[PDB]
Design an enzyme around this catalytic site. Structure first.
Site, PDB file in Angstrom:
ATOM      1  N   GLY A   1      13.952  14.109  35.674  1.00 14.23           N
ATOM      2  CA  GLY A   1      13.187  13.762  36.860  1.00 14.23           C
ATOM      3  C   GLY A   1      11.767  13.342  36.543  1.00 14.23           C
TER       4      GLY A   1
ATOM      5  N   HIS B   1      15.333   2.999  31.593  1.00 10.68           N
ATOM      6  CA  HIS B   1      16.511   3.777  31.992  1.00 10.68           C
ATOM      7  C   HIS B   1      16.479   4.322  33.416  1.00 10.68           C
ATOM      8  CE1 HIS B   1      14.588   7.690  30.582  1.00 10.68           C
ATOM      9  NE2 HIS B   1      15.099   8.006  31.758  1.00 10.68           N
TER      10      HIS B   1
ATOM     11  N   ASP C   1      12.241   1.407  26.004  1.00 15.99           N
ATOM     12  CA  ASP C   1      12.451   2.079  27.277  1.00 15.99           C
ATOM     13  C   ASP C   1      11.239   1.892  28.161  1.00 15.99           C
ATOM     14  OD1 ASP C   1      13.606   3.577  29.205  1.00 15.99           O
ATOM     15  OD2 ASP C   1      13.671   5.450  28.054  1.00 15.99           O
TER      16      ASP C   1
ATOM     17  N   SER D   1      11.153  11.363  33.868  1.00 13.93           N
ATOM     18  CA  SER D   1      11.341  10.064  33.224  1.00 13.93           C
ATOM     19  C   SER D   1      10.477   9.008  33.875  1.00 13.93           C
ATOM     20  CB  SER D   1      12.801   9.613  33.363  1.00 13.93           C
ATOM     21  OG  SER D   1      13.597  10.314  32.495  1.00 13.93           O
ATOM     22  N   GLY D   2       9.911   8.144  33.046  1.00  8.40           N
ATOM     23  CA  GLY D   2       9.104   7.049  33.535  1.00  8.40           C
ATOM     24  C   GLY D   2       7.677   7.358  33.897  1.00  8.40           C
TER      25      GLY D   2
HETATM   26  C1  LIG Z   1      14.516  11.321  32.972  1.00 10.94           C
HETATM   27  O1  LIG Z   1      13.921  12.112  33.937  1.00 10.94           O
HETATM   28  C2  LIG Z   1      14.890  12.183  31.772  1.00 10.94           C
HETATM   29  N1  LIG Z   1      15.338  11.301  30.659  1.00 10.94           N
HETATM   30  C3  LIG Z   1      16.590  11.310  30.194  1.00 10.94           C
HETATM   31  O2  LIG Z   1      17.452  12.087  30.576  1.00 10.94           O
HETATM   32  C4  LIG Z   1      16.859  10.292  29.074  1.00 10.94           C
HETATM   33  N2  LIG Z   1      17.890  10.783  28.121  1.00 10.94           N
HETATM   34  C5  LIG Z   1      17.667  11.973  27.437  1.00 10.94           C
HETATM   35  O3  LIG Z   1      16.646  12.630  27.583  1.00 10.94           O
HETATM   36  C6  LIG Z   1      18.731  12.410  26.536  1.00 10.94           C
HETATM   37  N3  LIG Z   1      18.588  13.669  25.928  1.00 10.94           N
HETATM   38  C7  LIG Z   1      19.772  11.590  26.339  1.00 10.94           C
HETATM   39  N4  LIG Z   1      19.950  10.427  27.041  1.00 10.94           N
HETATM   40  C8  LIG Z   1      19.077  10.055  27.947  1.00 10.94           C
HETATM   41  C9  LIG Z   1      19.446   8.859  28.764  1.00 10.94           C
HETATM   42  C10 LIG Z   1      19.999   7.652  28.362  1.00 10.94           C
HETATM   43  C11 LIG Z   1      20.235   6.780  29.441  1.00 10.94           C
HETATM   44  C12 LIG Z   1      19.921   7.349  30.700  1.00 10.94           C
HETATM   45  S1  LIG Z   1      19.241   8.909  30.483  1.00 10.94           S
HETATM   46  C13 LIG Z   1      13.898  13.236  31.268  1.00 10.94           C
HETATM   47  C14 LIG Z   1      14.543  14.289  30.409  1.00 10.94           C
HETATM   48  C15 LIG Z   1      12.670  12.651  30.598  1.00 10.94           C
HETATM   49  C16 LIG Z   1      15.744  10.622  33.660  1.00 10.94           C
HETATM   50  F1  LIG Z   1      16.633  10.167  32.763  1.00 10.94           F
HETATM   51  F2  LIG Z   1      15.376   9.513  34.281  1.00 10.94           F
HETATM   52  C17 LIG Z   1      16.405  11.590  34.678  1.00 10.94           C
HETATM   53  O4  LIG Z   1      16.953  12.599  34.302  1.00 10.94           O
HETATM   54  N5  LIG Z   1      16.220  11.298  35.967  1.00 10.94           N
HETATM   55  C18 LIG Z   1      17.158  11.820  36.988  1.00 10.94           C
HETATM   56  C19 LIG Z   1      16.539  13.030  37.650  1.00 10.94           C
HETATM   57  N6  LIG Z   1      17.451  13.719  38.546  1.00 10.94           N
HETATM   58  C20 LIG Z   1      16.933  13.657  39.910  1.00 10.94           C
HETATM   59  C21 LIG Z   1      17.841  14.421  40.855  1.00 10.94           C
HETATM   60  O5  LIG Z   1      17.943  15.789  40.481  1.00 10.94           O
HETATM   61  C22 LIG Z   1      18.421  15.873  39.151  1.00 10.94           C
HETATM   62  C23 LIG Z   1      17.531  15.127  38.176  1.00 10.94           C
END
Ligand SMILES: *[C@](=O)([C]([N]C(=O)[C]N1C(=O)C([N])=[C]N=C1C1=[C][C]=[C]S1)[C]([C])[C])C(F)(F)C(=O)[N][C][C]N1[C][C]O[C][C]1
Ligand code: NA
Length: 240
Positions: free
Chosen positions: A186, A45, A93, A188-189
């Site tokens: 942020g 994702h 994922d 994630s991964g």
């Molecule tokens: C991760 O950091 C993030 N994961 C998700 O948000 C995955 N996800 C969920 O946790 C929930 N509750 C529902 N759906 C999803 C998704 C489905 C498809 C895409 S997300 C962490 C909580 C582990 C990330 F998704 F990659 C993320 O949020 N990254 C973006 C970070 N931004 C950077 C810029 O500043 C704001 C945060």
């Protein structure tokens, strides 16, 4: 990471920052784990969007020169065949990124060690999640690498009604769930580093949290179980 403390510079050298270009600058969007000098493991994702990505290794403070960073471009993204965009809850994922060049290993840049295939951790095993994500639900990204102690919660307890129920599958590992510490947007991964036989090995790729917030009591942070994908991983690196 909510409820975290600043990580020391050389504690988790396999951690990477996945950044995509926004405007004239690049912005941190996900973490990851260096598994080969030219291969990074992250969450599917994170690389779903048609963006230009770069990997920064040897990173400690996002907005300040540490004098140890190496910036490499991403030349090939290989997402898991069964990953379904609209489906963090289905699993798969996981994604492997081929770097444009091999990074140089030193004390700030090392390969994370992966577990043997099929390895399942006992309940409450000692793990640490690391990352530069939100420090508070709806907060802001951390500037320096944060780390948080996150003991595992086995599948039985995690798939129980009071926890995640059916949302979690056996190809995922749950860690945390105390309402104080957790992964957050942020992170994630990135890696879930677990101590097994005196050595830290990466057992999870950070995947998701509750829609209600990051640090929710009884909603442990959920990771993709790396040990469920050892053959897929070696199969990708062997053929690319
Ligand atoms: C991760 O950091 C993030 N994961 C998700 O948000 C995955 N996800 C969920 O946790 C929930 N509750 C529902 N759906 C999803 C998704 C489905 C498809 C895409 S997300 C962490 C909580 C582990 C990330 F998704 F990659 C993320 O949020 N990254 C973006 C970070 N931004 C950077 C810029 O500043 C704001 C945060
Ligand atoms: Na830096």
């Amino acid at each position: 990471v909510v409820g975290g403390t600043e990580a020391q510079r050389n504690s988790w050298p396999s951690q990477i920052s996945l950044q995509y270009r926004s405007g004239s600058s690049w912005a941190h969007t996900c973490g990851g784990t260096l598994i080969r000098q030219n291969w990074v493991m992250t969450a599917a994702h994170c690389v779903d969007r048609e963006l230009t990505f770069r990997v920064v290794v040897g990173e400690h403070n996002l907005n300040q020169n540490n004098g140890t960073e190496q910036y490499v471009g991403v030349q090939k993204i290989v997402v898991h065949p069964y990953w379904n965009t609209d489906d963090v809850a289905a699993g798969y994922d996981i994604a492997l990124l081929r770097l444009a060049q091999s990074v140089t290993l030193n004390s700030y840049v090392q390969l994370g060690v992966l577990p043997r295939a099929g390895t399942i951790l006992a309940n409450n095993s000692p793990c640490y999640i690391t990352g530069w994500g939100l420090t508070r639900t709806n907060g802001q990204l951390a500037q320096t690498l944060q780390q948080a102690y996150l003991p595992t919660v086995d599948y039985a307890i995690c798939s129980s009604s009071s926890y995640w129920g059916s949302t979690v599958k056996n190809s995922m590992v749950c860690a945390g769930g105390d309402g104080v510490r957790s992964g957050c947007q942020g992170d994630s991964g990135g890696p879930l580093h677990c101590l097994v036989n005196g050595q830290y090995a990466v057992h999870g790729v950070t995947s998701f949290v509750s829609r209600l917030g990051c640090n929710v009591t009884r909603k442990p942070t959920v990771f993709t179980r790396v040990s469920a994908y050892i053959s897929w991983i070696n199969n990708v690196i062997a053929s690319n």
